[PDB]
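Hi D.,

Good news: the full-assembly prediction came through. Inputs first.
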Amino acid sequence: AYDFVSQELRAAEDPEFETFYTKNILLNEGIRAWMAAQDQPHENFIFPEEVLPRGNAL
Amino acid sequence: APKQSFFGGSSASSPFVYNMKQTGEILYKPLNDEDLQFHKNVLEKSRGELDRTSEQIARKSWDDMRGVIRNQMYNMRHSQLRLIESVESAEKQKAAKKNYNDLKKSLEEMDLAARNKKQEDARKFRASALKAFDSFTTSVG
Amino acid sequence: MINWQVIGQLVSLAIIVLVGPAVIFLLAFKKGN
Amino acid sequence: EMEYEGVMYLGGSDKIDVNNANIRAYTKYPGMYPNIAREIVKNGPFESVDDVLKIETLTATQKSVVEKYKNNLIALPSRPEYVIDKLNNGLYR
Amino acid sequence: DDITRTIPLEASGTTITLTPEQVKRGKRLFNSSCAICHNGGITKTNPNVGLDPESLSLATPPRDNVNSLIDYMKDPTSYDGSESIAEIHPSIKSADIFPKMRSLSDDDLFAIAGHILIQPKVASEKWGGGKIYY
Amino acid sequence: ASLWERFCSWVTSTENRLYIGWFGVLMIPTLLTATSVFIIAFVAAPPVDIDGIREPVAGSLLYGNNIISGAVIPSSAAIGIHFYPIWEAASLDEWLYNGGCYPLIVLHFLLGVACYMGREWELSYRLGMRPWIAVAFSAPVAAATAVFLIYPIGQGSFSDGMPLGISGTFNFMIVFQAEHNILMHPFHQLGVAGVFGGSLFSAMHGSLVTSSLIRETTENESANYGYKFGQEEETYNIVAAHGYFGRLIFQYASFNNSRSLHFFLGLWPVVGIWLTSISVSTMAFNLNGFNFNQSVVDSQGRVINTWADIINRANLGMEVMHERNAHNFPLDLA
Amino acid sequence: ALPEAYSIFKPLVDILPVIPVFFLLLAFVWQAAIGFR
Amino acid sequence: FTEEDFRQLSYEQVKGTGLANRCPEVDGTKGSIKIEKGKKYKIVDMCIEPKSFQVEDEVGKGKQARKEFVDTKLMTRATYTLTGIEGPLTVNANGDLEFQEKDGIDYAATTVQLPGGERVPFLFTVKELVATAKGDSIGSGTEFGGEFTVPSYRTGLFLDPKGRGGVTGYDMAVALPGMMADGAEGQDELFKETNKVFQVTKGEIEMGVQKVDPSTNEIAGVFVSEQLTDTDMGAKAPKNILLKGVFYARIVEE
Amino acid sequence: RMPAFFETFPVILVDQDGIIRADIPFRRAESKYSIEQVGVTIDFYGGKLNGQSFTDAPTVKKYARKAQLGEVFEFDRTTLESDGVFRSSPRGWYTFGHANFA
Amino acid sequence: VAHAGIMVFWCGAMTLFEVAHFIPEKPLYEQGFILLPHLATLGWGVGPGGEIV
Amino acid sequence: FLVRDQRLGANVASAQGPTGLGKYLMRSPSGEIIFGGETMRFWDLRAPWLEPLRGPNGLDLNKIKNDIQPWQERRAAEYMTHAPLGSLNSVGGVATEINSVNYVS
Amino acid sequence: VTALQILVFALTILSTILVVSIPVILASPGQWEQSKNLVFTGAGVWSGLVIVTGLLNSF
Ligand code: CLA
Ligand SMILES: CCCCCCCCCCCCCCCCCC(=O)OC[C@H](CO[C@@H]1O[C@H](CO)[C@H](O)[C@H](O)[C@H]1O)OC(=O)CCCCCCCCCCCCCCCCC
Ligand SMILES: CCCCCCCCCCCCCCCC(=O)OC[C@H](COP(=O)(O)OC[C@@H](O)CO)OC(=O)CCCCCCCCCCCCCCC
Ligand code: HEM
Ligand SMILES: CC1=C(/C=C/C(C)=C/C=C/C(C)=C/C=C/C=C(C)/C=C/C=C(C)/C=C/C2=C(C)CCCC2(C)C)C(C)(C)CCC1
Ligand SMILES: CC1=C(/C=C/C(C)=C/C=C\C(C)=C/C=C/C=C(C)/C=C\C=C(C)\C=C\C2=C(C)CCCC2(C)C)C(C)(C)CCC1
Ligand code: OEX
Ligand SMILES: [Cl-]
Ligand SMILES: [Fe+3]
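Then the structure:
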């Protein structure tokens, strides 16, 4: 039960619609892109520092 | 066999400072010419800031003259401490110790006349701390 | 190259643990309490 | 924008392209970052590559330090989305 | 391991051999005198100049050797050699303003600056990179 | 006989349907205005600038927001921990943009369960019994003080507190474990042993009663109809359920004193939620969890990762992506 | 550090704060020796 | 409430009271400020405070009806005024006395709320102001006026709720990967909410001195500012806004 | 290609050794190597675009993000009003029903 | 007063524990000192600028 | 970082921060000139190394631009790195930092 | 001076005998009605030796 498809269509069709659910999806793409080079080393994830989703200033 | 050590034996992971004492000399000299000139350099700077306080008493803006006595002159009591423990004789050291103490006492009475918004009382505590600043500098040479 | 500090820290810990149950161990022995 | 054709000049290569490049892109050249690139992001050269050597408030030994790296600078049309974060950029190590 | 700690002494490529003691002396003194601002080669209060192997080489004295780093802690300059950043950075010259520099010798500046050059030889991507290599 | 004593003996009267005692003079009007603002601002609140960065978050039922996404959003971070009631706003909708509904609910709810806790004392006085059900309610009240008040006290603004919503609690937990490492804190470690342990002993003690009932009932009807309410005798053999569990583990691992057994039910989850409520409040002042990042090193000094580093790569990924444009400087609140 | 006369006693004052933990644990030893009566 | 009445107050009695953003008046008339053609000059301390935010909205929108500026209500806080917008005044166009923008707090990001519940955000700024006035004297008249370029509200490194941005960010709606998997005429082309455009527009101002003092303390006058609002990096159309409050300045001789 | 375990994946280009060459980055400022920096060209083969090759840097990024999904296909999605998130096969729906009933 | 003795015995033994691990180059807060900042607030040993002698 | 980017030649007001607000200098809800960023919640700070830069209406934009004396940059760079943020095993950091310092405040 | 050094070392030796043997002597069934100024002698020489250590610290 990953996403509410009613609110992913809306947040793509409105760039000022935001909820704590929509903030929870961006936290999941932080976890899945930073941990993946270290958690699953057999896959050889060689993500550079420019393509992983960082926020701003940290 | 693993190289194990018991309560000492300073390898790369031993957290003990009973070894590893200093070998060479302390290359920071404690009171040399280069920072004593810097203490004379900030006494040129701090005397200009207490000179600058007179126009802000006349403008009656308190948070400048309560702040400009902390802005550049924060390292003034530290530098006045370092100058009086640099002189040679002891009976000239009393003359610099006393008017450093009469400076500090004069300075915060100017601050007590700054928070209470007392223009007529802060102008005499400014001039008393000013001539105690010039009495300090010919006491330390 | 002897440590001489945690020797002194643990020989004084052995003094300290031999204080609390040195009161009670003599008091159990002498019927007091 | 989503597509921008001048992304290979903003760092991570040579050819810094002074008009919209960050201040920390001059770290990769020695003698370039702290105060000599003050006057490259302030009063910036929005004319050409050789407008940065005719710039003023430089010492003559600072003007020769730009001359070592004249081929590592271009001049691009100044996009306003990169001029705003020319000094901070939100990009710390 | 740790057989090669062959850091360069000055320019033109003369090297030196650190020894095991000067490395435990170096890491214990880099910590608690530097590493509250340099936790893994970053600079926390000025992050676009750090302790990289690349960024220390791209200075007006190149700081990839130990004799330009002994001259750093005795007399610091900026990143382009013009100014002298000594009132905002701890050094032997400014050890009155910075009390942590007051007691350490010249012989353990060699231990501290031996640690700045050893760390890219064993922790190459992690030393000086940010949190991405944590 | 007085004009006040006739009122004072109605408030402390046990003849009412719900007890309306002297702590209930404070918790009835405070919870009813923490209910009437919670029900309205869950349905029809406007979007709230939580971070003070002029980007509002829309967490009410009018603005989309199925109820595993809607929340009474916390206050603005430009407001901070400043007292923000209605009369200190220029207008009522200006009060709604900065998130004024969150301190109006959460200061009345916290003052309401603090006087629920005194009311749970108060009926145990007028009924003549031992009074420490107020102590057992002090574990949820502290845990509702830890996420709602003490974490906004230590961490600055009221925006760091828990959002009053279901998906807001999951956002509160991920942002907490990014910056405070609650999973490797040894007092949250005790609380999940009082939550799993309390859930064990509910399923353990509740099993051994219902598996040793004496049959005061027939076969086809329900089993619960054999306990007449208010009877004198016990409905289950304690000696048989002790002799069951003394064969399961061993004989002296089980309480055949049912008062010491039932105290152990009241001690294991209540002390555990007391230690969780401390841990979130000590992490509010940034005494974080354990940090075994990069501890294991080999002889050459190369960093060997352990299992606390793969937690840290999760902890760093939810650190860079929470508050994605609210940071301007490289360290988070340092 | 300590004054230079009392610098030898630095291993002595390293465990002296631990003694108020031992006073709590002394009461459980004294209760067990009398038999928890 | 002049400058000389405000500088005597401590910070402990200004903080919190809402008086720290109040654009200090003066009390003066029958004065002039002469600006020499050779000497250097600078405005300093140019505090600008608006009042009565008004957004232009359509009432008929077909024919025979105007665009009446509906009165709104302020929605953020008391964060709206500007402080210390110094700039050099000594340039002289065939007469005109113009001053260009130098530095200071040019902008203030506030939102106001239209009738209907819609909150429009806008960036009240005077950045790149070049305001000319006819004549060489200053006081009781001599209305300045010029164009200021506003920047956009969000910058290029403002990330969306779905992680899209101009300078940074994703370049696709990444939570809908099946819409990206189309090849022809359906490959997230429905969204140009993705391509974020940092667009820069211009606004006009006109300010009257409305009072003077011949020593210092230049105007404590009024201003009228027409301006566009936030476009959400090129997602929604901007509205016009009309601001009319009180500014104040101080000319020093340089 | 993105594996089955992920849901969002950065579109990185590799050679036959595993090493990166282009990445279409998240942070355009100081990106060391991008799609238009190294200048990758698409040469389509087979299908609807048999022989259509183009080196336009905006149009290379379009078919780069699609080809991490595995293969490019033209979808007719104005029929069932499709929403754009991947559903699950009856192979995977049976196993949800039968390993939860059992 | 046995227990008032063990409050003062903590204050005796911890303040000797703080000054044994002193290391005068570091500040008070870089060593985990908790009773020496209570005595430096009262002006014992503190000099100008915050350093202690 | 107000000091450092001013030393790189930026006008430190009119920052144009990323959300549209102030990056370095900002406006308080009561109308004072305060520091921008996440630190606007701590706007009511009275601290003896910055109160020589506050006028009556908050932080003065003229005293910041000129009289920003380097004992304050010493105390800012120390107090940023010596932040009350630690661990239970005494590791100084933001809880994702590698261990090389033992510092909890 | 090192004559102070053996004085305070004699204090920690004597107080080790004092802190053990005072609650042994009080809480025995005997030994308190017999030996009150065996404790107060030992408590007197303990308070005596602190004063002797006290003003020798000035020299
Ligand atoms: C298997 C894994 C596991 C388990 C068992 C737990 C267990 C727990 N976590 Mg935890 N956590 C986990 C994983 C886990 N966590 C992970 C992976 C993370 C990282 C993402 C976290 C992050 C995390 C955080 C950040 C926090 C916890 C907290 C807690 C505690 C919550 C229960 C509690 O104290 O509420 C106690 C009960 C209440 C708060 C309810 C109060 C009830 C009030 C008084 C009245 C109710 C009002 C109500 C409306 C009336 C009803 C209406 C009526 C009409 C019926 C509990 C110990 C919290 C904690 O310990 O502190 C609070 C906490 O803050 N966890
Ligand atoms: C909220 C308060 C509630 C009460 C909480 C406190 C009580 C809880 C128990 C915690 C205390 C446990 C005992 C003390 C441990 C730390 C002592 C220590 O080693 O200091 C550790 C310090 C380390 O010294 C360090 O030095 C550095 C200098 O480079 C720095 O100055 C550091 O700041 C300094 O901490 O000193 C020692 O090394 C002493 C070692 C002596 C070896 C024997 C010690 C034996 C102590 C434990 C005895 C058993 C008792 C355990 C409890 C039994 C019941 C479970
Ligand atoms: C003890 C019994 C008290 C009476 C019964 C309780 C009724 C509960 C009402 C429901 C909650 C309402 C919450 C307000 C919801 C709310 O936020 O309202 C706010 C509301 C909005 O104000 P505006 O935004 O219109 O402000 C005007 C400006 O915008 C104009 O420029 O203010 C009012 O209109 C007045 C409302 C209070 C008027 C109350 C009456 C005042 C008389 C006081 C009499 C005291 C004597 C009493 C003797 C005991
Ligand atoms: C053992 C002690 C230290 C060593 C070896 C050390 C080493 C260095 C070196 C080599 C540089 C580069 C200088 C340059 O390239 O211009 C540097 C920069 C810097 N260090 Fe340190 N450092 C030490 C202590 C500290 C401490 C404690 C601080 C924190 C107050 C600090 C703050 C800085 C800053 C801010 C810079 C950047 C200077 C700039 O931006 O121009 N240093 N450090
Ligand atoms: C000079 C000096 C010194 C020394 C000192 C000394 C020697 C001291 C002594 C001290 C002492 C000698 C102390 C003691 C104390 C004690 C106490 C304070 C006690 C308390 C007790 C208690 C608390 C008890 C309780 C109880 C009871 C009542 C009964 C049963 C139970 C119990 C056990 C709990 C040194 C060298 C270190 C250093 C330098 C300085
Ligand atoms: C000042 C000083 C001193 C003093 C000291 C003291 C005052 C001590 C005390 C006290 C103490 C030191 C006490 C002790 C304690 C002990 C121990 C040893 C601990 C613990 C134990 C335990 C823990 C056990 C327990 C148990 C039991 C038996 C019962 C139940 C079960 C259990 C297991 C729990 C002297 C003179 C030496 C000199 C030097 C310095
Ligand atoms: O908003 Mn809620 O939050 Ca826990 O941090 Mn500080 O402020 Mn934001 O941060 Mn990273
Ligand atoms: Cl920030
Ligand atoms: Fe039962």
